[PDB]
RNA sequence: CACUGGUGCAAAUUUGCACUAGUCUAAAACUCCUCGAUUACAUACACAAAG
RNA sequence: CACUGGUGCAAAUUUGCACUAGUCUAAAACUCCUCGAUUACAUACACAAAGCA
């Protein structure tokens, strides 16, 4: 695969105004450098960049081509030719519209008027991306909270919550002046809130009820939990339509408009995390700081301390424009293969932090130019191999300069030294970090709200949500900046709902810090009896087991020291496992254990895992390994082990193992790690496939509201009655009269009629069931029921479609007969169910055809 | 930037002018001339002499004022180039241009016995004049080095030792003058030289020239050794007699003939020196190069092993890779700079010369054998190139193509470049017969005596001196052979019979090839000699030791008397890092160890030398030499630290060095080697630059004596004049003739009245006494000898030229006579006087470019002020 | 920041500038080989050890 | 193995190919930050211990 020569050469964007064109080049990060202004009529050019700032030299410009060359050596200064974007056939305007044709309507909603430019729409599409990611996360969180109850038919208790109602009104609905019917809705949802608290399952999210029976602390805890759930419910109302087809418009303003008590909760949660990190930070990191201060002979100790705090909390090394971790991995891969020995496994995080910090200070302070040089090389790179080679070449240069330092760090990486350093006094003052320290008061409420949301998410979910949000705010701030520049000077005033986007630069910086602090391991909640039941059940246990029996086996009631080995082993390897929490939150322990019985599903997951990893698992988990075993034999053994696992296998585990006792203990931990990882891989992949469908539904509801204003035919229609209405209406018009604003259907007749055939196969009832199943994660909920039937498991996509197809046809549909017959998903059934997304051709083809669905599959394809 | 002549770039080598014809030549391979056209100077009719295949240029219109031509090979896509017709000159009746000096007719008579109405013979003669200029520099340096060795006291007798030697006397006459039939005065003069010769042998300093006396004291071996030394010294004295005049203004004319006319014992010595060198290279060459030959045979799949071995012998001894028309070293350097940065890693430092030989050998076979056409194309692009940046671009583009071809081979070479692999290849039994090289080996009998004489001269020289003398000689011989070949061709057919003393030049083609081999073998590291106590005293003294130290103390400190195992670490460390350093040998040869150590204390002088060194190199020196180095230090702070280290160095700092160091002790030993290396380099840079400055003045004196002798034949007013009586006589006489008689012989003076009047003011500012003292100081390297005496007095050390002139001016003004008028300003200023330089250089005024270049600091060095204008 | 030829502009006293050449100038003609040069260089890896 | 521009080919037509772009397509603009991912991740070496309605 080759990257764009225009992107590589340094050309970031060509913005089109009414009679002018603005050309930008890449600045640091996502910064745009205004280079030239070009008149669209006589092609006159004005350079806007300074000679020092300029990255590209503009050559001839004509109606069809733009010519430029890099000022920094890309392709040795060779001329590059790109299309003049104003040049399009059968289009009068130089500025193009969106494929959906909603550009004018969207500009009105966001800026209050239409514009003869393509800049505002680009910013608006970025905001739409934020809503798409929020819709996926709100759906997942709402489902997990419902699953925590054990719903059984979907009464969504999140639905009756309102961030508008204070905790007092929520606890006392008949103690206010609200609609009689409203009072009733609160009661129903207040019951479920008390039910959820009863389960103790909120402990999984780090939300632990108070140890004391203090009514004050208890109500304080309940009030914070109520605010979090109400805020989640409020976000869901903003990105999903109700039965009336209406959505709240205060997604970006509500956190600052609602009662201030909610803000106190957001402040409390952030303060709790920031206060612990900020308290005696030097004392808390004295080991690594002391080693760094001795090693970094060129630096002042207070400067090293300030840099280390940034490295931990601000993570400035993640804003260099290159991966420091990738450089460290390359160094160890080719030179430091010694540091990869199992001997350093116990100290691997600490060692990597020291190595990463030395590399960080090298490019952030000592050699900034080298960092900028490396970014330019990576930007100029045209293939993945070239990029890997650039990291490899730089690793060689880094190894020559730090190999002695890395070896010194390796020498200090041992319990003796680390324990000694921990005891050692650090003669340092607390107030050195007074300037660098970040506090809750320094963050906007929207950023604090995103931090709060992270409580319900695992590490990957936090990374995916925060990285997407940070990228969108970063793009939105750049667009506002270009528009407000003297050279461009376009109006761009956001309407009342979107005033938040004026602080996009601050939000991008704050969200970055939130991603860092949210990724840190939360203080563990005390393991509850319910958690122990989930842990025993996932492993395999008697369906009839009682709470009294579980407590006796784990000696939960008994008081004493060293008699809780089994309880400790289950807590350390199961309850505290991120994979286990993900499985409990989105699935059910008993159903997961049953699904694990299926070798076909298990083998499919095992097949995905790399061969060397499978070999490591085989060596670690099998008591009597067959050395001459084939890779398929190793996968089969691992699969059989997962099939026969049970709680009974770990009843005699010795937490305090000594000598060869350790061998059995280590084997038991490896087996549980492998079992939890495989089940987690299956459930996570299914939730991820489902998220693509959540996006389509969110877009369809969103697009319906936008088209409705510009399509008179849709005026009486309700989406909930028939999800196929947007694609159906748009299709007919195309065939009807060159009348359509949707470029996808209008431009492609074959793609327009293709969707029609699919729309006809569908029905209002089926599509409604599909929309409900997508939002309710029914495919994960009913995985055990139909998963066993599947004849062959070859993709998550095929697994998801078969289960959904069984849930939809359950008690007719035309495809039901071939479905139960074939024991495989029906492709045409998929196109039919996806018919409501026909209007968006790329989304419809990506979600309908397996080969196009996953960006990571079929890399070896031309 | 600087642009090359488009005429040269397009392919026109020269326009030879005869009485009625013009011959146009283009560039063939290397220095070869391709006769392209004959043009009649009257009707401008043209005849093509070149074949269609050989032709490199197409001649367009030719008229009285201009010549139009274009390249047949794509220069400027066939653009018309316009050059002046050389026969068109204002105020000149003849189509044939004269030399600036007006000595063309006299020079033609000296070399050919008659004058010629052509510009060809003179061009050949100017090449011969170039050979004499370079020889004048080297003999002056060798004679000074021999005098320095004697620890001379600069008495009346500088010339006694070398001056009284005669190549016409055998070793027997020189050693027993009383038994000769020579005159009583001559016998007396021989005894003064014999006494100095015995003094030279007594010093035991000849080991510095690789002329170590035999270990055994048998008379036969000792007499054979002394005889060889006498032959070498007599030959050097003979050469000095040929390029410099005596008190009477007389010089020998047998420079090119004497080696073949003197006693055969002299030729035996030349054969012995060459044979010793060639026999060691020739004996078991395959076994001696088995590591590289074994690796190359495994790698070079398309070549037979015997072919690789023959090519490898050529690569080491013949160096055919240095005759390709482009630099293999430059191509290899570019490849490493851009794509092979891993190869530049410090892990390869110990095997770098071997690794480079392997890489360079692959590039050599690629252009010499596999892709000859690629090499020819590369030469054409380089000839066509108009600027240095264009040339660098051509090398860079070719390097990119070579990297694609040779990346796997270069990686394979690097994989083998380690001690374990080299050690194993070293132990392997190589089944290749030495007889494979029977037809390729060069022997002493294959070389002319003149070539052997040049080899002999190399004993007295360092590597840079050998490269400078040999490259200059090879280039002049290459030019002379081309002019002779052109003249003897059927198309030109001009007589060109050299007179008897110059018949050697008939063999110029053979001499050019032989000197090339001499350059290769002479640049070969000589076998380490046995360090004498004298050398240990020089090494300890240069490092810094108390002046009263005794021979016994030195023998005691280094355990020279003691016999044992592992007790000689300090002696070995001094030998490996000081005695064996060519920088140290150069310093001892041209200066004294004690004076150099004293000069090293002048931080201003050290800072000036350190200032010339590139910043990346200073950073390497700071890292390697300073025990506790500040990371934050500025480049000027780093230079200052290095200068302070040089000022503070002493022998005492190294007395606890352990040769067999380990761990942290080893780091200290490496630091000690680094400090000594930096110290020797800085001092060497200072002394070498001053000797090089002095060489320019030596050339001026050589030219003045040569020019005075030639002008004496055509200027009646110079007939009763003795040059040594007043060095200003040629400049004064030529200027005076121009002003009144309108003398027209010297074009530099006749043409530029303003410059002639300026020279007259400078002659008037000087006098016979000062110019004679200046001539003596230049010939005796007085500036280098007296450097410690006056260098401390300089206020600002700005350049080598200003250092040389300040010291020179202090030497001229020193009392021992009326005060020179420039003395008061010189003493007050603490810097050289520009007017004083012009007055001292006034004897060279007759040659305006030389006078300006030697007088004006800005014009002196071709490598300085590249940006300025 | 040269010297000399050729060829132009311009100044204006006997000037300069520009372009362009020159193996028949200056350590000095293209490409090499060199030198500047530190980065040395060098038929034998480097150390160590010894003649 | 997409979608849409632009630019070429075409002999084959509602078409096809190649090259090439695209933040105004799709989870989808460079470099990051991420994800794929197993290799988890994580202010405090690891272990043990502390962890019931
Ligand atoms: Mg010459
Ligand atoms: Mg987008």
Numbering used by the authors:
A (entry chain C): 50 to 201, 205 to 863, 872 to 922
B (entry chain A): 49 to 864, 870 to 922
Quote the passages of the study that discuss this structure, keeping the authors' original sentences.
In order to understand the structural basis of pre-crRNA processing and mature crRNA recognition by Cas13d, we solved the crystal structure of the uncultured Ruminococcus sp. Cas13d (UrCas13d, also known as RspCas13d)-crRNA complex at 2.15 Å resolution using the single-wavelength anomalous diffraction method. The binary complex was obtained by the selenomethionine (SeMet)-derived UrCas13d (R288A/R823A) mutant co-expressed with CRISPR RNA in vivo. The SeMet-labeled structure was subsequently used as a model to solve the crystal structure of the unlabeled UrCas13d (R288A/R823A) binary complex at 1.86 Å resolution using the molecular replacement method. In line with the previous studies, the mature crRNA containing a 30-nt repeat region was determined in the high-resolution UrCas13d binary complexes. Although the conventional bilobed architecture consisting of a recognition (REC) lobe and a nuclease (NUC) lobe is still discernible in UrCas13d, its compact structure blurs this bilobed notion to certain extent. The REC lobe consists of the N-terminal domain (NTD) and Helical-1 domain. The NUC lobe consists of two HEPN domains (HEPN-1 and HEPN-2) and Helical-2 domain. The mature crRNA is sandwiched within a positively charged channel formed by the REC and NUC lobes.
